[PDB]
């Protein structure tokens, strides 16, 4: 109870990887290469909070 | 009488099925390299399996 309990924090850090955050995309490649600048700042602004 | 075409795409939201349209490279194993699919991306050593 004390090893899984480290894995589920782990896991579950790498879960917040694939979660938009509000904005449009996990994936940031995308964001980078979808929307213009100031945009991609805004949506990597939320991904990054 | 014109033939008027009003051409239009959409990437940016799906993987693609019109791909090929120019020259790919070749590959190289057990370095760090930067590959490029059809849809994903990313940056890793490419080990054989």
């Given amino acids: 109870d004390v090893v899984n309990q480290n894995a589920q924090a ?3 850090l790498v879960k917040q990887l694939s979660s ?5 995309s996990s994936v940031l490649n995308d964001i980078l290469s979808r929307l213009d600048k ?3 700042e805004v ?4 991904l990054i909070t | 009488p014109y033939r008027v075409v009003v051409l239009s795409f959409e990437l940016l ?5 019109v791909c ?11 370095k ?3 590959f490029n699919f059809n849809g994903l991306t990313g940056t890793g050593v490419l080990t054989e399996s």
């Fill in chain 2, 13 to 17: 939201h799906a993987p693609a099925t």
């Fill in chain 2, 32 to 34: 760090c390299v930067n």
């Fill in chain 2, 20 to 30: 090929g349209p120019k020259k790919s490279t070749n590959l190289v194993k057990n």
């Fill in chain 1, 38 to 40: 100031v945009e991609a």
């Fill in chain 1, 10 to 12: 782990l896991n579950t």
């Fill in chain 1, 43 to 46: 949506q990597i602004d939320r």
């Fill in chain 1, 20 to 24: 938009n955050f509000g904005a449009i």
